[PDB]
């Protein structure tokens, strides 16, 4: 189970937290009003985080502390809603029987028990807040039969714990108060219990080669990264512009665009503009067929199974049928594969032929195109 490992890691955390030789010291404060022992101040825990974790941002370490303290590993002594606030307020760890890692699950009758007990320990005030008084009202209205032994065991517990010493009753009641804060929290702060229903159950090359490839593929667009270093400062997000994308709309490229075409004809064909200009050169050079074929293959790989046969036979009769004008050119195993598969229209029909013609084009056309006068004149401006 996933979150179990999460709680285990944070258990590692607090275990290092209350370390014997190191750790925060749980002090006993003395006040003009009283003498409170076994607490400490949130600035202490903040300092402890920063020391032993090297969390550079005070804010970052504070957020880590925030969610830890909202998982019941320490609480503010005078508040319901778990939040670590860096100041002089008094905290406390929790008990190994009341972590949240122990698969615990309270239920409505037990909430009624804790309500009766708190409301009946003191009888000086409605020692509670409005949400908890509201919860008890509902529990009354719906638990009409079963109340009595609730009250019974409540005051029984009260005697069984008050019989032990006065500081003992205080610390135990504080702990077994906060642990029900965390498992039924105030309306505002998020619960930290729930989980998502999903979890509710060979040729190789040297790394240096990959290093060069990765660095270089970074660099060749490194000057295109619109997060790191963008030459077009036009940011429709940041600087309230629209012109950048709108220039991206127009068929006229950017000089960026034309320099970017020059890397690989694959990227060119990705570009519609690149498709158009490459096709123009192929036409004016009387060499506009293989690109026509490959575009044909790709435009065939887009339609559903309703048209696959309607196109495959037709495309054969137009290009791959010997005697048609468009003369795609195959070797032995290529044309063999084509003839065998052409009976059956397939989603991967012309793989080897496409490989053949594709390596042809990648090896020949793109080079001369980048070397071409039209390319140079368009990249100049």
């Amino acid at each position: 189970s996933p979150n179990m490992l999460v709680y285990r890691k944070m258990e590692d955390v607090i275990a290092r937290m209350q370390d014997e030789k190191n750790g925060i010291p749980i002090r006993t404060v003395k006040s003009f009003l009283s003498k409170i022992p076994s607490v400490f101040s949130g600035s202490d825990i903040v300092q402890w985080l920063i020391k032993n974790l090297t969390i550079e941002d005070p804010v970052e370490a504070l957020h880590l502390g925030t969610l830890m303290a909202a998982h019941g590993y320490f609480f503010p002594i005078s508040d319901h809603v778990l939040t670590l606030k860096d100041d002089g307020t008094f905290y406390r760890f929790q008990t190994p029987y009341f972590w949240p890692s122990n698969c615990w699950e309270p239920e409505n009758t037990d909430y009624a028990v804790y309500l009766c007990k708190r409301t009946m320990q003191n009888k000086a005030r409605l020692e509670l807040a409005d949400y908890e008084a509201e919860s008890l009202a509902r529990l009354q209205r719906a638990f009409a039969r079963k109340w009595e032994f609730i009250f019974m065991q409540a005051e029984a517990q009260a005697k069984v714990d008050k019989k032990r010493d006065k500081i003992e009753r205080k610390i135990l009641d504080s702990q077994e108060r906060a642990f029900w804060d965390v498992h039924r929290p105030v309306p505002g702060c998020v619960n930290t219990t729930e989980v998502d229903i999903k979890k509710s159950s060979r040729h190789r090359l040297k790394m240096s080669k990959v290093a060069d490839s990765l660095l270089s593929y970074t660099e060749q667009y490194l000057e295109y990264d619109p997060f790191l270093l963008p030459p077009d400062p036009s940011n429709p997000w940041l600087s309230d512009d629209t012109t950048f994308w709108e220039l991206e709309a127009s068929k006229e490229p950017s000089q960026q665009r034309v320099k970017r075409w020059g890397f690989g004809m694959d990227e060119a064909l990705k570009d519609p503009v690149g498709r158009e200009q490459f096709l123009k050169f192929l036409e004016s050079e009387f060499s506009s067929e293989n690109l026509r074929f490959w575009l044909a293959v790709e435009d065939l790989k887009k339609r559903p199974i309703k048209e696959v046969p309607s196109r495959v036979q037709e495309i054969w009769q137009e290009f791959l049928a010997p005697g048609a004008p468009s003369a795609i050119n195959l070797d032995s195993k290529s044309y063999d594969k084509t003839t065998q598969n052409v009976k059956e229209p397939g989603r991967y029909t012309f793989e080897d032929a496409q490989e053949h013609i594709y390596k042809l084009m990648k090896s020949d056309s793109y080079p001369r195109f980048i070397r071409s006068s039209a390319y140079q004149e368009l990249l100049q401006a």
């Binding site: 019974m152 065991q153 029984a156 517990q157 069984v160």
Partner: peptide
């Protein structure tokens, strides 16, 4: 009532001791 009460008391006591 007395039997149930005594049982509940001793049981909660044994529980709180097992927790300690």
């Amino acid at each position: 009532r007395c039997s149930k009460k005594g049982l509940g008391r001793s049981i909660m006591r044994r529980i709180t001791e097992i927790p300690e």
